[PDB]
Ligand binder design. Structure first.
Ligand SMILES: Cc1ncc(COP(=O)(O)O)c(CN[C@@H](CCS)C(=O)O)c1O
Ligand SMILES: Cc1ncc(COP(=O)(O)O)c(CN[C@@H](CCS)C(=O)O)c1O
Ligand SMILES: N[C@@H](CCS)C(=O)O
Lengths: 392, 392, 396, 392
């Protein structure tokens, strides 16, 4: 079996089948023609390998999908217009009124909003459980429980889930487990190999790597993904990925291993620096010995990742002064870009939450999230250093 | 007010704001940075006009949106990853369990599937009505009727609705009218100017014109479009349009008037041709005097369009052989490309309907649809001619 | 029957592409790839010496670029095409392969600025002889032919005063003496004029202009005989310019070519109405538009061009001074160089697109001060009229 | 002075100057408008710092140019359609008939062809000289010598020049030293800091990194680059780089450091392996202690590069057998891609030639050259291994 970097570059593509083209040609076309109507009928009915319409399927998208499937150790992949496209397309097809879904305690803002203000308002029961607490999860299960959805690590406080433990329990009850693997990527964590049924990504982040596209990926079993393609995507979201964006995403994935290594190495130095600093109160970085879930993080993630969260003594006031003083880090939402980014999740990425919902689900007061980029660490260090002095 | 063609080329853009660039630069970027976190907080709150993240809003997409709104004569526009993206984003935000939607008698297949197998399985009630029979629409109205959704002309049989008449009834009872204006474009028909509240397009078709992107547009009031953006798109579908694809859509839109004029003139000649041929049983073209709703067509559409539907005397067998015989026309779904396209739902997309629902909602088995392209009319006639001999 | 040539519009959309040979894709997939690989070493042996019809490197050849080329060839009525990174890429790649020190090139009296500079300050400084000739004067062209004359090169209509040449007459002289005729057909496109059908050996285009139609790419095309285009490909482009067209840009060019006939019809109808409006105006000294009977070469235009085009050149009374106040007052027209965009443009050649000329060279080669060039776009004609009208009022 | 990786991501771009866009917007526009014709006339004369036409200058190309200038430690950059674009625009600008150009002993095929069959047939004199041998180079200088042009490393294979020594000699005669730095990239070697006047690149190779664009770069002093822009590019080649491709090139450059590190580490492993094999007569790789110019290589290059050339004992026949048995390496010319590439010039690029022609050019019958990609080294080793066994 070829290695991870080899498959990220080559999997599912032989140049000899596309006139020798080293880079696959981009199928920037909306529709496909048939040699006969009989051939066409067969494509819609499902009984033929082939194409008809890019919302359903497209060869550039198919390559991305097969390749992502290989990196995650899944059977099938699906490409969508956004991470939210992936999550909604997935959850819209698996759930109906009277089904319940068990969620991780903390979710990405628009995931939270979709669950509570979106699909939750169409008769689907929601309940939040700590997915590190196995006995609390077992107690939460009902016969209505159809899906278990969570992020690990969780946006934006780094809370881990026991994916093996959760999936053991889900097998007993006949529940489908969906893991948002955006933060880690398949290079660092493969929830399907820990017993998850489906993984979703915002391919907008690390998988793209360069901040120039919005995209989503689902990977899992052939049977789940075929349902998500033919119902969620085709009929319920229409979250179709541009073939052009899919080729940039494939371009990004070719350096995923190298990029993640550098995100991790830079993030480690910055986190360790931030530990030894008088202005810092807490730190959530999985690679610090201090990290409360350090043991669980190491059983699931091969490296501690590119994201750091921390609080300052000074609270919300020092937050503003720190961020506004950054000269190399940029003040923005998003993560997993070559550029280093800094954000305040309560006013920005999780601004769908009210002040009570902020506090209820572990989203703090003076919390600053860093997405550590690929710049020279000395420059990043100097910038964080001078920004701490400015926050007094 | 500048002419349609002037606005399709210029509206919403001054080169002087973008370094003199004649063509707007493409904002192929996922995220946008802030100069301060208080500037950032103001953007998320709506208190500051600015950009943060492309799934919510992006300047290339905003120009497309503003231009399309001008062309439809409406206040605001939203760009999405597909026509289905437009439709689902729209209806998910407008409807909740116990709401009722009145539907045109015949709908595009994936719209039909979305309604009956998607949103209608989450507790939204559906009723189909003949939108040309105004008495029957009035009689079907209930206090739970929140949305009237239809296409005019409706695919594949070209059935029309009196938009102003429907809008009147909707105004009386207090319902929102949503019209799928894909077939006509704002160039031939403007449902907002006849009392409709929202219009949706598969911009994949005539607005693009060249078959190389998938895309959707919603136009209506600022109030409604803001809700569809911040709820339907942001949280419930994630059907984000690529900035690259939006730029190509704008490019297509600049020749919209010219292309539609040629589409219509070609289709008229072809329709008049087909009506005189011995193999043709029935033909539906708005520009033929024999069209059932000819008066309504001339009232509502400034030209009869590029789409033809006809039936061959010899049933499904003849349709198949007609389709297989075409050399210049391609056998494909989709419509409104430069390339002429034929589809015979009976031996293709019967169209995710049942045989009973096909026959009940008006989709015959001898029926072929033509999207008449921009080729030389003599070449198109000669291809059709020989395919009719072959049909026997 | 089936030996009928398909119509221009049909060929502009379809020629050289069958969806069946690319998994049914209706639009051809874009080969955004630098290099191509070989199944065996021996298959790759035959691609650097042509036994096998196959690909190796995009600077020489690429399937997206080849489709563009075969299609432009069909539209121009030539055997072969070559796509390049710009108009200047097409011209320089062509002239660098055809000329060597000691050869003479006879040139039209007026040339696009960068072409002029290329000839006088570029290739003219490497031992190539230049002489200008009025190509509308067939007796003078005959008199200028010498045994060293290798290439006759001109634009028709010329940029920017729209001087014309009799292409068929120039070619007949060239047949007798043994010279290669190269016509720059940027202004007309193959929709309005086809110099290869009138006897020319090569045509070149700034596809940046009407062929693209939307101002978003820079590109060139050369069309001619297989032997001359192969020479240009393997010498001019490969070794002497490296003016390689991006497959992305070639795709966008093909996209624009699909509406070339419709866009040109509207450009020509808009410009005709605008020219007739401008002829009837107090402030205009002279108006040059091929569709007005007052055009100095009216009958030659009617003879060679099927429609009069989208370019207008005129002078105001008030001279250069009045020119600035008119152009300054425009609000729908844009002040900019280039042409053949959906957007209507207005410019001043002597300070802009013919800056490569000195004051001496502008007056000698037919470029006035006070000349206002208009590229008439695809906007609603009433809007363009209203804008030019109000700008005339402000130029008094 | 920020680090290399930081500058490769950030240099010359502030998001705040473009509505916050994290990634720079792509100026896919041929022309630029003016607010007045006064402003317009000034741009052409050089008195006003604006934009007018993308063949001369474009904001997206300018950013690429400033960034490459920074990485090479030069005053100014120029982006062109290809590496040959950059070479030809440079040489057409600096040379006239009767000038002499002093050349490295071996050159890239198309460079050689340009010199001998292009500009050389316009009265420019050519002389080849060993650029490591300072006394022969000094001896070869004439008053006609205006340019000294070479690659380092070159490709007969990997022969190096003493760039600081060449520059010392050129300064005594006013001559301009142009170095093709394609193989190293600015990350490994910066010829301008060792005294060269101009560097050219085929950015098609490592700078892009992904095999998807053709592009060239020139970096040097403002006055030379200005003339190459306004004469070579503008008038003599028209080798204009698409802004789309320039954007992809910039995207590629953000991982340059990480890719070059991995190219080099894979190459070092394969070189060590190949040097010990019985099938291998001879090997050229700068990282091997046996490399003839090891000391000179280490003075100029921070790492030994991703290219290896070696000679098999079985001659042309074993060369072919090796190539044909490769499963993971592709048979292709070009280099610097994520995909590993092999060429055997004796049976590919120079097969039309005689066994005597190849000999005097420095091309052994069994000479194979490898562009070592970014795949996992164990897979590359397995592929090279079995191919060596098949070459017997
Ligand atoms: C874990 C996780 N899962 C899904 C998404 C949504 O993906 P998108 O739909 O591509 O934005 C995101 C996007 N969150 C960004 C910014 C989006 S406003 C952030 O955390 O700052 C995510 O972080
Ligand atoms: C007849 C003719 N021949 C060559 C060119 C050069 O093509 P480009 O190199 O694609 O701009 C052009 C482009 N002309 C523009 C160039 C802007 S300086 C103009 O005159 O406005 C042309 O019109
Ligand atoms: N409405 C279009 C495309 C969808 S598959 C059609 O029916 O052809």
């Amino acid at each position: 079996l070829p290695g991870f970097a080899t498959r990220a570059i080559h999997h599912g593509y032989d140049p000899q089948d596309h006139g020798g083209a080293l880079v696959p040609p981009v199928y920037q076309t909306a529709t496909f023609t048939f040699p006969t109507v009989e051939y066409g009928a067969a494509c819609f009915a499902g009984e033929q390998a082939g194409h008809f319409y890019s919302r359903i399927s497209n060869p550039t998208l198919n390559l991305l999908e097969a390749r992502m499937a290989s990196l995650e150790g899944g059977e099938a992949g699906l490409a969508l217009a956004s991470g939210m496209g992936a999550i909604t397309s997935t959850l819209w097809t698996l759930l109906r009124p009277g089904d319940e879904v068990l969620l991780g305690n903390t979710l990405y803002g628009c995931t939270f909003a979709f669950l509570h203000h979106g699909i939750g308002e169409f008769g689907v029961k929601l309940r939040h459980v700590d997915m590190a607490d196995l006995q609390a999860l077992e107690a939460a299960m009902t016969p209505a429980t159809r899906v278990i959805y969570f992020e690990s690590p969780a946006n934006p406080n780094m809370h881990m889930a026991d994916i093996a433990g959760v999936a053991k329990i889900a097998r007993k009850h006949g529940a489908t487990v969906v893991v948002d693997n955006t933060y880690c990527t398949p290079y660092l964590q493969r929830p399907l190999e820990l017993g998850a049924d489906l993984v979703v990504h915002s391919a907008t982040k690390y998988l793209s790597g360069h901040g120039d596209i919005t995209a989503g990926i689902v990977v899992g079993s052939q049977a789940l993904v075929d349902r998500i393609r033919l119902q969620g995507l085709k009929d319920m979201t229409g979250a179709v990925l541009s073939p052009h964006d899919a080729a940039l995403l494939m371009r990004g994935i070719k350096t995923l291993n190298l990029r993640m290594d550098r995100h991790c190495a830079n993030a480690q130095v910055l986190a360790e620096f931030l530990a030894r600093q008088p202005q810092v109160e807490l730190i959530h970085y999985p690679g610090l010995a201090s990290f409360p879930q350090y043991t669980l993080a190491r059983q699931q993630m091969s490296q501690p990742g590119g994201m750091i969260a921390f609080e300052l003594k000074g609270g919300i006031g020092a937050g503003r002064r720190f961020m506004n003083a950054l000269q190399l880090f940029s003040r923005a939402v998003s993560l997993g870009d070559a550029e280093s980014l800094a954000s305040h999740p309560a006013s920005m990425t999780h601004s769908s939450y009210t002040p009570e919902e902020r506090a209820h689900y572990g989203i703090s007061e003076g919390l600053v999230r860093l997405s550590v980029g690929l710049e020279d660490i000395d420059d990043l260090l100097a910038d964080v250093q001078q920004a701490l002095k400015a926050s007094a």
